[PDB]
Amino acid sequence: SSPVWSEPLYSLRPEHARERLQDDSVETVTSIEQAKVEEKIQEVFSSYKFNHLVPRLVLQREKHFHYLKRGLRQLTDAYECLDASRPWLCYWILHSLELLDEPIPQIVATDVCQFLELCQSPEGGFGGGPGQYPHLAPTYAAVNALCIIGTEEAYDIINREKLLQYLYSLKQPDGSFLMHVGGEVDVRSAYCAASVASLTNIITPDLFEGTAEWIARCQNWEGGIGGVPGMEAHGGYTFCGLAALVILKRERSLNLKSLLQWVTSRQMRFEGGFQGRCNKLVDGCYSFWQAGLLPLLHRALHAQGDPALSMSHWMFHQQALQEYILMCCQCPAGGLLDKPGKSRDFYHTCYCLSGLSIAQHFGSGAMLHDVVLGVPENALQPTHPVYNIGPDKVIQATTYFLQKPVPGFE
């Protein structure tokens, strides 16, 4: 083996060069763009190698922390484009802090609760800011943020009776949900609805009638899931679809074989990160949307008695994903990003870190097996692959709300 101060990396093996794109001497826009990314990424990988000396990789926790802490209070007018997404900013930042094991001061926690209360609509659900109409996306974010805070004050913000009525007001006869009143339908809504309804204990027998079948119709010939039936398989919508089915305990509605083969194919042989769709570019946020499918698939297959499942690893290259995130997705100023050359944002900070945590931590039954690449301080807190908040927060919230009745229903 090696001294503790050098750690060989998969992306730096000499044979790794064989993984560069083969364009068959037929150039199209797709291959040209892919080759450009690979060239940049090779330059990055090489910068971490000094012949046989390969220093341990470092997650720049303190830089990320300072960037997050600042964003939680105040933002310049450059963030006007997120004025209808403020609960997202709360969730992305709080979840990142949670992953980094950075405490949330009580005063900050109370202030977040107060703000999310202002975003809650009288009709149920939460909007993108105070006085905005409710929408399933900020509803999901707000509920998750409140669960990360996890105080009785936070839990009780949620108007559960109106929330359930709001979900009903979005439910379509074909099993699908609108994202908001008079809004668009795609598989995001099924996941948002299932996530908030299960956390807050407001699921009725009829709420999700037909929903599992509708999601299954979104799985396509590629094996992944599109936004609506007919559409191209996409890692974000696939995460939504499978996670919703896990909550509904209807994973078997899908062809799990074709799904598994599709998602594992989305890990890039050269970059080590994931792409969102076949023949598109690597992107740090798919470290979560794609890689998070593997723990979901593991649980699903394990529930079916699959005798071949690993007891130690997810079915993707955990080390390679960590290498891509740590070497390519960190902004030296703090924050994380899509790929080298892109600018940081809180969304990529959230999902790059979430994906890193999935890659570091395997658990199934009584078996736990960690693979933390780099210095030991790189270890993040675990994340729940369905909800993407800490598993401790999921248990605490679900336990709290299970003590309350389903609103107006027995």
Partner: protein, 315 residues
């Protein structure tokens, strides 16, 4: 009337025709979080938007105001919803609104709200006549725009505009045969028109795909489509395909071809093939080659497949 960037733009708080309504400030609370320090122009428009929203004022002035609010944040779905309430309430010319949404989408083609708004207009008008050409223009700028493809699928299905789509698919595959969105559209068109049960159609599709693979053998999309159109009947139901792939192996032993062979072997074993021990041995050998040499990024998957094969077919 006047745009936000125009030299003669005036803040709503300064407009005489708005003097009768008081602006409504956003209350972020006494101790704000994720607080955006808005520009004066942004806050001014949104203070007046909150005012008209609160009063439910269905007016021409409110309608024009939504256009500015949208320019400032086109992801504000509340503004879009209100604009639609006004379109109906004021009986606005929907063809003019179509010209508007056309321009907006060109500017912001990755935004959910703008596409949804367009769909609502087309639904209200029951007029799909501009859609295929408009979408094709958007796709000419980004051939993989997910919103554009989704809207295209909706329009074709809702208004039954199938007649020319395979020709459109063929044109785009000529431009970039690696465009997975276009392979997906190919499946969409065929499954919804002739279907793949017509054995003549399936043969045409298998031939076409094999030709594309020959031209660009490391293009994953064509390989995935080949599997996609055969998998439900079962890869082992196509005995000639195995032979053909086996012939290409020595000269084109890509991970895509080798993976496809394993997929065939998996299905064969599932269907009581002849020479099961032999087929199992060959499949395990390929899984090892994939895991160790040809597709090492997926070592865990290929090891799983090898164990899965043994759990199902060892005897």
């Amino acid at each position: 009337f006047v745009s936000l960037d125009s030299p003669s733009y005036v803040l709503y708080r300064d407009r005489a025709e708005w003097a009768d309504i008081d602006p409504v400030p956003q209350n972020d609370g006494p101790n704000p979080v994720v607080q955006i320090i808005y520009s004066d122009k942004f806050r001014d428009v949104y203070d007046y938007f909150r005012a008209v929203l609160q009063r439910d004022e269905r007016s021409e002035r409110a309608f024009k105001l939504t256009r500015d609010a949208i320019e400032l944040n086109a992801a504000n779905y509340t503004v879009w919803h209100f604009r639609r309430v006004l379109l109906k309430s004021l009986q606005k010319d929907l063809h003019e609104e179509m010209n508007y949404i056309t321009a907006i989408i060109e500017e912001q083609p990755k935004n959910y709200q703008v596409w949804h708004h367009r769909r609502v207009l087309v639904e209200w008008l029951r007029d799909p006549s501009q859609e295929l050409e408009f979408i094709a223009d958007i796709l000419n700028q980004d051939a993989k725009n997910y919103h554009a493809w989704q809207h295209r699928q909706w329009v074709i299905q809702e208004f039954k505009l199938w007649d020319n789509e395979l020709q459109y698919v063929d044109q785009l595959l000529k431009e970039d045969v690696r465009n997975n969105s276009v392979w997906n559209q190919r499946y969409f068109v065929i499954s919804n028109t002739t279907g793949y049960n017509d054995r003549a159609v399936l043969e045409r599709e298998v031939q076409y795909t094999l030709e594309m693979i020959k031209l660009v053998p490391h293009n994953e999309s064509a390989w995935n489509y080949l599997k996609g159109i055969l998998q439900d009947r079962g890869l082992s139901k196509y005995p000639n395909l195995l032979n053909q792939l086996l012939d290409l192996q020595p000269s084109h032993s890509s991970p895509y071809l080798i993976a496809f062979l394993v997929d065939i072997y998996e299905d064969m074993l599932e269907n009581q093939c002849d020479n099961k021990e032999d087929i199992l041995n060959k499949a395990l050998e390929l899984c090892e080659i994939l895991a160790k040499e040809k597709d090492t990024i997926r070592k865990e998957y290929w090891r799983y497949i090898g164990r899965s094969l043994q759990s199902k077919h060892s005897t």
